[PDB]
Amino acid sequence: KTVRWCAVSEHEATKCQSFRDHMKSVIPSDGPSVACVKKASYLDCIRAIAANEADAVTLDAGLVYDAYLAPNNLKPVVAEFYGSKEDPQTFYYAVAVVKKDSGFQMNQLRGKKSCHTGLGRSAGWNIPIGLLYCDLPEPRKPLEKAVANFFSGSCAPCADGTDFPQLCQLCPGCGCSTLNQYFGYSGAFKCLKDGAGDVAFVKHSTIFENLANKADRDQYELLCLDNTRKPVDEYKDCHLAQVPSHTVVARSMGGKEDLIWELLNQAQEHFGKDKSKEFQLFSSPHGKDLLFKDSAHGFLKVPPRMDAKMYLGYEYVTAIRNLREGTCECKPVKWCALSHHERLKCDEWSVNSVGKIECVSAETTEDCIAKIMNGEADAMSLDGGFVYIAGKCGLVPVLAENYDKSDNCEDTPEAGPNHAVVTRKDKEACVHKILRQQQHLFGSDVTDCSGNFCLFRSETKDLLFRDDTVCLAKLHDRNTYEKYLGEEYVKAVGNLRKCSTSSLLEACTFR
Amino acid sequence: RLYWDDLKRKLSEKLDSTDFTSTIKLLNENSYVPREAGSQKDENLALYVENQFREFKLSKVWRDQHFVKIQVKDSAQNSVIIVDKNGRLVYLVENPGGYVAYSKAATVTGKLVHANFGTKKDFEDLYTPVNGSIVIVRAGKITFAEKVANAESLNAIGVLIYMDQTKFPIVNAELSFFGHAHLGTGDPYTPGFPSFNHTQFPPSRSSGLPNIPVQTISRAAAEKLFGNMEGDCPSDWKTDSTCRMVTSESKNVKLTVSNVLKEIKILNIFGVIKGFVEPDHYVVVGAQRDAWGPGAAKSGVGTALLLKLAQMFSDMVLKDGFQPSRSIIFASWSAGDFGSVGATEWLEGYLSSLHLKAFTYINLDKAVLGTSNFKVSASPLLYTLIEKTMQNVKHPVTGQFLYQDSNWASKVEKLTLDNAAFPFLAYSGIPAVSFCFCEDTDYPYLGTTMDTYKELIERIPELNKVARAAAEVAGQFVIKLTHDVELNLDYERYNSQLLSFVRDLNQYRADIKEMGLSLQWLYSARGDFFRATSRLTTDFGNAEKTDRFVMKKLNDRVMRVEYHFLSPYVSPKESPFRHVFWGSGSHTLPALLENLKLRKQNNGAFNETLFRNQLALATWTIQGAANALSGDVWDIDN
Amino acid sequence: RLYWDDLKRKLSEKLDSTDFTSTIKLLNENSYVPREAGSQKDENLALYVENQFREFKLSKVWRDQHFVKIQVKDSAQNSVIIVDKNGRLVYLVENPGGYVAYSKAATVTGKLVHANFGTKKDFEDLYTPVNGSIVIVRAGKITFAEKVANAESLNAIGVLIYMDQTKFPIVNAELSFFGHAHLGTGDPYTPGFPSFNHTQFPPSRSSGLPNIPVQTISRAAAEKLFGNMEGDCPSDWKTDSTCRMVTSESKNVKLTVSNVLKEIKILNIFGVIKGFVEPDHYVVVGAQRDAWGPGAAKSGVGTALLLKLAQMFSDMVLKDGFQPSRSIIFASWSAGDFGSVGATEWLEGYLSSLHLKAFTYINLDKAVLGTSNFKVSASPLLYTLIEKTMQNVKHPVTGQFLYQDSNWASKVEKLTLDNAAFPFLAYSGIPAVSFCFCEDTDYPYLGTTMDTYKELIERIPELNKVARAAAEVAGQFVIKLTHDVELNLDYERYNSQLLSFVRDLNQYRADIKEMGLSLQWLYSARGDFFRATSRLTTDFGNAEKTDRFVMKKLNDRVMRVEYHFLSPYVSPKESPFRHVFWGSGSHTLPALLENLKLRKQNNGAFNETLFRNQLALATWTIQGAANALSGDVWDIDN
Ligand SMILES: *[C@@H]1O[C@H](CO)[C@@H](O)[C@H](O)[C@H]1NC(C)=O
Ligand SMILES: *[C@@H]1O[C@H](CO)[C@@H](O)[C@H](O)[C@H]1NC(C)=O
Ligand SMILES: [Ca+2]
Ligand SMILES: [Ca+2]
Ligand SMILES: [Fe+3]
């Protein structure tokens, strides 16, 4: 069946029809075909797939957020990797490139000319403006007005020129397409090379793509976080932040995800990098970064469980949300419930803690772990097998369920592995604080559980915590999935995960 | 085109060039000097407000006329005298100028007892039984009608209201004051329905009407009565040393009230500014116009702010270029001294038209009484809208912002019957807000003939700066609610409100366990309400703000929370204040706790059959509100 | 992609390949042969319907369990005997198998009078006073509960219900039948609120419960009683020649009923198909599952149609490619024989969730009883939706279309208490429709033990063709309401309804003029309602159909007309049937006319103070509905 691909401007349109022709000859009629849809911007492509006019289009990690938002509802299905085919990389470096001996650093960018890849882009907007956000003059909302006053002249593609003229001073109208002289990675570098801007925010591979001469490449410098300038070749040592790779998005329901990857897998094996001289998948004589990025070496399949918020991660999703809204004693701990009985005991615990601990229920045990990831949940109790799965996603355990009665239960931990309370990295301080006060009020008590509340007692058997637990012991060391379980247990559940694989474990291993 | 910061500065610049004191002084002219409801002077100012609204070039300006019944002191003056055990003797105390509206009007005689404020708690502590005797109470803490209601319940024959020197430091002791004893809002002769000629005015009367005569007397007249009484008043009450407890066995008081009813025409005049995106949704800004006396603090300020906010916002639309997403209605209410009649009759008549269309009411009455502190009584949802405005508006006297107390939400007082915002929140289910630059002690010359412009200037020197600050707070409420496509109604706030109710009910967990009742269902009802707001908060996070359709589907769910708290089990005619948090009735949540307080004392006052029903409906009211908030009709669990 | 004509043909093709008779026969198996409410056989078919819905791959399938109280004939059998003036004598008449649910259950004795049908009109024509005596009435014309209610009002001690040969040509004269005497709908022990464990089941009882014992007896048992009675029944009543008027002065009847209450679990199972444009708006299709006897005509047909319509519509979405703009919910109700309990408890529990979200209810119960004529009872708004369907669907026996009578709208009968669609229209305010391929005479074996599949096949030879025609009419209702972006709810139709009410009130214009009342305000209220629909009709004409936002603002105004006819003055707990056109109460429009009929007879039954209030609220109910329909809140005139 045919797959409608969305193309931006004339440049991507010409590469699309050429891609449709070259693929038609090598692949039979029974196989997949490629169709092309004309669109003015990337935003028009997202609205097209949602309206069933197109099927798939590649976007930047920072533009995936926009595609996730209702009523577009797009999920990343195929992600491209950079570097080499032997060693795939699902993340690229974002750096700031300036001219040699300019006399400006990372902390001093006010009243300076800037060149961005595009509004909403990872390396061109989300990161560069993100570090300088809480240093911007009031007000901070809207975001575009503060950048307009910070930089004397800027060129940020896909931006409203009528409301913010200063962001389209270097590039009139702010074109979202290749039709604009300064668009994307290669366009933002051309904004620096021509002498229009003082600083350009692009990728680490952008310099090598535009300049081939070794003498010409030493005419630039990279700004670091500690206000220092390091060599262009040294990008691993000096960079802003590591961002997720570009990915192709499709509809969550009925977005033929299995048909699109079946098309792109055959595209890289016939017209990929260093495969054919007639047509290249990651290179075009009409322009740079068309359809797919020139720095890409292949494609990789994105697990079904992994959604757009999971693809970017908590660290990046929160950064975008705070960048648009305007945000620079502990908050209630949202506990995750599995069954009807667990949330019934949770609701009674919520009232007794006086709003210190809330309750959010999920369908299965695996679904609760995903909620702690994006921020819907905060903490929950899990057995040793699930601690390995939660730990591989990025959740560290803080408390251990002790079944032995001792003098100092909270001071000394138990080895047994036992059930552990896992939580998000940023809530480590709060969870270990609030729950410790709850044990002093509802922990070990007399047979008065008929009148008063008892945390370690359930209506049936093992609800929020196990019934044979004395107290939840705090870990002295910062234990991870490997530190808590031990070197012997990790290898045990790892080999068992090979035959019995869950959807969440495969999704967290992707990154 | 224009953002929040552009709007903040454009409003502030208009406020600096606006003269408030000149407007309040113009309303206190000899032409509008006395503004009794349905009087010539009331209509005169009404025509003035109509023309002024028409001069500001608003979208539409219309008037609504009602024919309501009020009570007035006619030919026969009311008198209070002391008599002997056999007949008329003693001496004539006073013939008051002032009176209490909607009084029984009957001649009564008997022993006199000081009930102090007249609070249900005050009566319970009285060592002297109030049964079959006239009670005298100080003005304050509560409503007159509340004062009378508490007395009538203990079988009192009548009620006398006076102002002590301690609470009311007034020089003149011969000064009389006005009030009303109707326990409710609106016209008491047209409950549930509007006072239009369409209803033909059928024979119907409100249950809130008192069955005993009520009269207000001066400080001097009270001291004359104390002279004939014996027994020193307890140090618990902050009152004068003249205060006496009961009359002697030889002499007792005789009160006679003879007020008659009068049919009058009330004019309610409105002004609207149509929105560009959703004109059908609107925020209402109301202000009282009528006053028994001169009314400078009661209605003088409020009406001045109403006219000026309607001016400033109209100039921002036409001249500046401000485009409100939702409409704004300015309302000049009449007959407010009689229990917010004009406003309640409008809500009772166009109830269907503003169902889920009106999302907020801002009240401008009594916004300026002092200068010490800033007090606001509103719905939980507007809590966050206020908090944000408090840390943005500076105090008129000092330099600091209004946001100084972090735990200000817990010190917020509930809306009372005398407030014009009460009918909007408890009857209609529209979140309302009433703010004040109040003082520690209430305004002394409030319901008196000394509510003049001169007295307002003397007490508040920098009146112009405080009125500008008042209009700035009210002005930012309008902006915030009509500027952004996202509603500023915080549904999240309420969870603290439900948690508070269940914690108070958790204290009596032993008494509930004794009966064949469990509390686990109320824990889930509360929990499900959190999960509903949490799901809605994430649903706002995963949606595009620029899209009109997705947002409207989400904002309509927010506009239903206040409605879903109105009890759907009680008749709106008999129990108009349906709201379960801030209403009056056995249906309300506080009443459920109050009824269970009688259980712990083991007396014959606790009704078990009533409590089992009270708990049943309230559990489902909170649950139903939770189920309707998120997950549609199939995504719900239980 | 697909239009109306494409949908009409795709539905018809699926109907031709669908075998109905095989499904009805499968439901009449020994496994589901007896389906009493809350029984094992009822749950068995419930689990079957749940699994079947899950097999059709619908969007979501969920169940709701209620714990309601019903009445059953237990250990002590009820008996009817004739006794002498001093004590027990005569002979034992019959011990009935059948009983009447929600009966008082008490032993009573006294004189017997034939009230015929038991209509309030029947009692008024009786030459024999019914006060203090047991009455016997034929089944028909009205509800049992209505029959009992009319008798209890005239102080009758008890009620006997039988089936004559004339109205019910049944061979077996020993046959017994079932029914219920509760004047209302839903669980009578949980009025206003749902029967969930959340409510803790408090001590509360419905006013609709009878205070006198009721029993059903067979034709043979009645003839035995007539043998002891004297006086020939008047030719006015179409009844048997055995019919006798009153018992002799020597002997009288003694009825004893001893039924007990039983708590049972009811399961309501639903199936939904999510819409693509507006999933939150949905149309509900319901059908009764339980039956006292075998139930072939009562619930056999209805449940068979429910399952097949859910199959056909699911296949059109998944396979054909049909995209509904609004959701469709299929509902299998239980405890319907006891007064549509399952359906009313669902409406009482999720009232807030379906407020202005559910816009139509389609009832499939008793859709097939005969073959002669097609009868439909529905709201005025669905009138045009039906008219269009009638001239599109052909009759199963003949070749002609169902649309033959042009003035069919005027011959439409109001929905009754026994119908499952009544609670939806009168309590919730959701337009409901109930259609039938009925006969001149009602189905004889309806509430009996002879409601078998065999008897249905013998009476209706071509059952498969009539069930297909029934599903076709119901199927086109769903399509039309979910296919187009414009709602097919005709608000225009109602004007005829209001005109009819004012013309009937205009006949008594002299009596109104005599009192201090005018009718001019009701003329305007009616007129303003026309102008409101006329303005809305033009507003649809001047708007683009493809635009989502403009249409949604207009369709929401259409969804509010039925709601605005529910009285906002009466308590939904005491008077659940708030609807002023088709409800029960002093609040309804018919009751206003019925009360004024007593005025012309000059007797002491007309209440002037009640009539002045009745007229006041109703005038404003029609006016308020008019004002809220068009012109927003400022474009209104008066
Ligand atoms: C309304 O009724 C009042 C009497 O209560 C009368 O004076 C007035 O003229 C009437 N107005 C209309 C429009 O009927
Ligand atoms: C509900 O109450 C009934 C008794 O009326 C009991 O049998 C049943 O187990 C209860 N179910 C729940 C969930 O409480
Ligand atoms: Ca009224
Ligand atoms: Ca119920
Ligand atoms: Fe990128």
CA–CA gap between residue A293 and residue A295 (Å, rounded): 5
Nearest to A141 among B4, B520, B542 (CB): B4
For A225-228, the CB contacts below 8 A with 24+ separation are A225/A106, A227/A105, A227/A106, A227/A107, A228/A105
Same domain, B305 and B394: yes
CA–CA gap between residue B251 and residue B111 (Å, rounded): 8
In DSSP notation, B511-525 reads: HHHHTT--SHHHHHH
Contact A423, A372 (CB under 8 A): yes
For B505-513, the CB contacts below 8 A with 24+ separation are B505/B592, B505/B593, B505/B596, B506/A351, B506/A352, B508/B593, B508/B596, B508/B599, B508/B600, B509/A451, B510/A451, B511/B596, B511/B599, B511/B600, B513/A451
Parallel/antiparallel/unpaired status of strands A74-83 and A296-301? antiparallel
Amino acid at A472: L
Same domain, C111 and C10: no
Nearest to A255 by CA among A57, A74, A31, A6: A74
**CATH for A1-99+242-328, among 3.40.190.10, 1.10.357.10, 3.30.230.10, 3.30.565.10?**
3.40.190.10
Nearest to C32 by CA among C49, C18, C19: C49
CA-C67 nearest atom, ligand 2: 5
Contact C336, C288 (CB under 8 A): yes
Look at ligand 2, atom 11, and give the residue with the nearest C-alpha: C197
Is there contact between C and A if contact means ≥3 C-beta pairs under 8 Å?
A: no
Same domain, B277 and B329: yes
Q: Which two tokens stand for residue B627?
A: 């189920």
Give the domain-ending residue among C228, C257, C286.
C257
Q: What is the four-CA torsion angle of C194, C199, C204, C209, rounded to 10 degrees?
A: 20
Nearest to B545 by CA among A220, A71, A189: A71
**Residue C377: its H or E element:** strand C373-378
Nearest to B269 by CA among B298, B306, B301: B306
On whether any CB of chain B is under 8 Å from the CB of C62, the answer is yes
Nearest to B445 by CA among B238, B335, B296: B296
Beta-carbon contacts of C448 under 8 Å, excluding residues fewer than 6 positions away, are: C98, C170, C175, C176, C177, C178, C293
- Has A185 been labeled as part of a binding site? yes
Among chain C residues, the shortest Cα distance to B512 is held by C200
Which of B64, B66, B67 has most ligand 1 atoms within 8 Å of CB, for mutation?
Answer: B67
Among chain B residues, the shortest Cα distance to A138 is held by B5
Contact A261, A301 (CB under 8 A): yes
Burial (CB count <10 Å: 0-12, 13-18, 19+), residue A290 = buried
User: B94 lies in which domain range?
Assistant: 77-257
Same domain, B334 and B448: yes
- For chain A, give every domain's residue range: 1-99+242-328, 100-241, 329-511
* CA within 13 Å, CB half, C539: 17
Q: Which two tokens stand for residue C291?
A: 């039956």
CA-B201 nearest atom, ligand 1: 5
Residue with tokens 């975008």: A320
Same domain, C412 and C557: no
Parallel/antiparallel/unpaired status of strands C107-110 and C112-116? unpaired
Contact B305, B474 (CB under 8 A): yes
Residue C173 DSSP code: T
Give the domain-ending residue among B257, B288, B315.
B257
Nearest to A474 by CA among A425, A434, A424: A434
CA–CA gap between residue B181 and residue B104 (Å, rounded): 9
CA–CA gap between residue C348 and residue C344 (Å, rounded): 6
Same domain, B138 and B24: no
Beta-carbon contacts of B352 under 8 Å, excluding residues fewer than 6 positions away, are: C560, C564, C568, C624, C625, C627, C628
Most A CBs within 10 A among B518, B542, B552, B636, hence the mutation to make, goes to B542
- Residue B446: φ, ψ to 5°: -70, -60
Centre of ligand 4 to C-alpha A186, Å, is 69
Nearest to C439 by CA among C464, C421, C465, C466: C466
- Has A365 been labeled as part of a binding site? no
B101 bridge partner residues: B180
Same domain, C295 and C351: yes
A474 bridge partner residues: A399
Contact between chains at B568 and C352 (C-beta distance less than 8 A) = yes
CA–CA gap between residue B300 and residue C511 (Å, rounded): 49
CA–CA gap between residue A423 and residue A402 (Å, rounded): 18
Nearest to A359 among B510, B527, B544 (CB): B527
- Based on its alpha-carbon atoms, the radius of gyration of chain C, rounded to whole angstroms, reads 25
Q: Which two tokens stand for residue B31?
A: 């032409």
Contact between chains at B354 and C633 (C-beta distance less than 8 A) = yes
Look at ligand 2, atom 1, and give the residue with the nearest C-alpha: C197
Nearest to A69 among B5, B531, B544 (CB): B544
Contact A379, A336 (CB under 8 A): yes
Amino acid at C276: F
**What resolution in angstrom units was achieved for this structure?**
3.2
Among chain B residues, the shortest Cα distance to A325 is held by B541
Burial (CB count <10 Å: 0-12, 13-18, 19+), residue B398 = exposed
Contact C573, C192 (CB under 8 A): yes
The 3-state DSSP class for residue A398 equals: strand
H-type alpha helices, C561-607: 589-596
State the chains in contact with B (3 or more Cβ–Cβ pairs under 8 Å). A, C
Nearest to B202 among C203, C350, C612 (CB): C612
In words, the CATH class of domain A100-241 is alpha beta
What is the b/e burial string over C562-601, where b = at least 16 CB atoms within 10 angstroms of the residue's CB?
Answer: bbbbbbbbbbbbebbbbbbbbbbbbbbbbbbeebbeebee
Look at ligand 1, atom 1, and give the residue with the nearest C-alpha: B197
Contact B8, B476 (CB under 8 A): yes
Q: Which two tokens stand for residue A397?
A: 């355990």
CA–CA gap between residue C60 and residue C67 (Å, rounded): 24
The 3-state DSSP class for residue C478 equals: helix
Which ligand approaches the C-alpha of residue B185 most closely?
3
CA–CA gap between residue C458 and residue C467 (Å, rounded): 15
Residue with tokens 């002077």: B41
Q: Which CATH number do you get for residue C23?
A: 3.40.630.10
Chain C residue numbers with beta carbons less than 8 Å from the beta carbon of B609 are 202-203
Contact B595, B610 (CB under 8 A): yes
Residue with tokens 């000899």: B30
Which ligand approaches the C-alpha of residue B67 most closely?
1
- Method of determination is X-ray
CA–CA gap between residue A115 and residue A196 (Å, rounded): 8
Same domain, B229 and B272: no
Ion ligand 5 contact residues with beta carbon within 5 A: A 60, 122
On whether any CB of chain C is under 8 Å from the CB of B430, the answer is no
How many domains does one find in chain B? Answer: 3
CA–CA gap between residue A494 and residue A486 (Å, rounded): 12
Residues 188-227 of C with CB under 8 A from B: 192-194, 196-204
Parallel/antiparallel/unpaired status of strands C107-110 and C214-216? unpaired
Q: How close is the nearest chain B Cα to the Cα of C488, in Å?
A: 22
Residue C566 DSSP code: B
What is the b/e burial string over B399-419, where b = at least 16 CB atoms within 10 angstroms of the residue's CB?
Answer: eeebbeeeebeeeeeebebbb
Contact C334, C363 (CB under 8 A): no
CA–CA gap between residue A79 and residue B209 (Å, rounded): 74
- Has A92 been labeled as part of a binding site? yes
Could you tell me what percentage of chain C is helix, strand and coil, using 3-state DSSP and rounding each to the nearest 5? 35, 20, 45
Give strand ranges (E) for C299-372.
326-333, 358-363
CA–CA gap between residue B192 and residue B213 (Å, rounded): 25
Beta-carbon contacts of A391 under 8 Å, excluding residues fewer than 6 positions away, are: A397, A422, A480, A481, A482
In DSSP notation, A199-211 reads: EEEEETTHHHHH-
CA–CA gap between residue B328 and residue B313 (Å, rounded): 9
Q: Which two tokens stand for residue B571?
A: 């008749």
Contact A350, A359 (CB under 8 A): yes
Contact C557, C490 (CB under 8 A): no
Nearest to C495 by CA among C525, C458, C455: C525
CA–CA gap between residue B450 and residue B170 (Å, rounded): 10
Contact between chains at A451 and B509 (C-beta distance less than 8 A) = yes
Ion ligand 3 contact residues with beta carbon within 5 A: B 186-187, 190, 345, 348
- Residue C123: φ, ψ to 5°: -65, -40
Give the domain-ending residue among C257, C277, C305.
C257
Going B54 to B59 to B60 to B61, the CA torsion angle's sign is negative
Nearest to B619 among C59, C198, C570 (CB): C198
Contact between chains at B351 and C270 (C-beta distance less than 8 A) = no
Q: What is the four-CA torsion angle of B5, B10, B11, B12, rounded to 10 degrees?
A: 90
Contact B374, B437 (CB under 8 A): yes
Nearest to B350 among C62, C270, C633 (CB): C633
Residue with tokens 């459920």: B592
In DSSP notation, B437-502 reads: EE-SS--TTSSBTT--HHHHHHH-TTHHHHHHHHHHHHHHHHHHHHHSSS----GGGHHHHHHHHH
CA–CA gap between residue B343 and residue B363 (Å, rounded): 11
Centre of ligand 5 to C-alpha A323, Å, is 17
Burial (CB count <10 Å: 0-12, 13-18, 19+), residue A468 = exposed
Amino acid at B107: T
Most C CBs within 10 A among B329, B357, B519, B571, hence the mutation to make, goes to B571
Residues with a CB atom less than 6 Å from ligand 2 = C 67, 197, 263
Three state DSSP letters for B254-295: EEECCCEEEEEEEEEEEEEECCCCEEEEEEEEEEECCECCCC
Q: Which CATH number do you get for residue B577?
A: 1.20.930.40
Contact between chains at B527 and A70 (C-beta distance less than 8 A) = no
Contact between chains at B620 and C198 (C-beta distance less than 8 A) = yes
Could you tell me what percentage of chain B is helix, strand and coil, using 3-state DSSP and rounding each to the nearest 5? 35, 20, 45
CA–CA gap between residue A288 and residue A280 (Å, rounded): 12
Parallel/antiparallel/unpaired status of strands A91-99 and A199-203? antiparallel
Contact between chains at B199 and C616 (C-beta distance less than 8 A) = yes
- Has A116 been labeled as part of a binding site? no
* CA within 13 Å, CB half, B545: 9
Contact between chains at B624 and C351 (C-beta distance less than 8 A) = yes
Going A461 to A463 to A466 to A467, the CA torsion angle's sign is negative
Residue with tokens 């008077």: C575
Parallel/antiparallel/unpaired status of strands B134-138 and B159-162? parallel
- Whether the upstream peptide bond of residue A137 has omega within 30° of 0, thus cis, is no
Beta-carbon contacts of B585 under 8 Å, excluding residues fewer than 6 positions away, are: B567, B570, B575, B577, B578, B591
Nearest to A261 by CA among A77, A10, A138: A77
Q: Which CATH superfamily is domain A329-511 in?
A: Periplasmic binding protein-like II (3.40.190.10)
Tell me how crowded residue B191 is: count the other CB atoms within 10 A of its CB. 21
Same domain, C478 and C563: no
Contact B322, B10 (CB under 8 A): yes
Same domain, C194 and C264: no
Tell me how crowded residue A95 is: count the other CB atoms within 10 A of its CB. 26
Burial (CB count <10 Å: 0-12, 13-18, 19+), residue C227 = exposed
Q: What is the four-CA torsion angle of A181, A182, A184, A187, rounded to 10 degrees?
A: 80
Distances A16 to A2, A260, A267, C420 between C-alpha atoms, Å:
14, 15, 13, 60
Same domain, B184 and B54: no
Instruction: Assign residue A174 a region (left: φ > 0; alpha: ψ between -120 and 50; beta: otherwise).
Output: left
What is the biggest distance separating any 2 CA atoms in chain C, rounded to whole angstroms?
Answer: 83
- Based on its alpha-carbon atoms, the radius of gyration of chain A, rounded to whole angstroms, reads 26
CA–CA gap between residue C398 and residue C401 (Å, rounded): 8
Contact C502, C509 (CB under 8 A): no
- Residue A319: φ, ψ to 5°: -65, -35
State the chains in contact with C (3 or more Cβ–Cβ pairs under 8 Å). B
Beta-carbon contacts of C288 under 8 Å, excluding residues fewer than 6 positions away, are: C298, C299, C302, C303, C333, C334, C336, C337, C340, C365, C420
Residue A475 DSSP code: P
- Has A79 been labeled as part of a binding site? no
On whether any CB of chain B is under 8 Å from the CB of A376, the answer is yes
For the beta sheet containing C373-378, the strands, ordered from the edge strand earlier in sequence to the opposite edge, are: C60-72, C260-273, C326-333, C278-288, C358-363, C432-438, C373-378
Q: Which two tokens stand for residue B612?
A: 């089992």
Same domain, B356 and B486: yes
CA–CA gap between residue C417 and residue C433 (Å, rounded): 14
- Residue A308: φ, ψ to 5°: -65, -40
CA–CA gap between residue C482 and residue B531 (Å, rounded): 31
- Has A121 been labeled as part of a binding site? yes
Among chain B residues, the shortest Cα distance to A377 is held by B534
CA-C197 nearest atom, ligand 2: 1
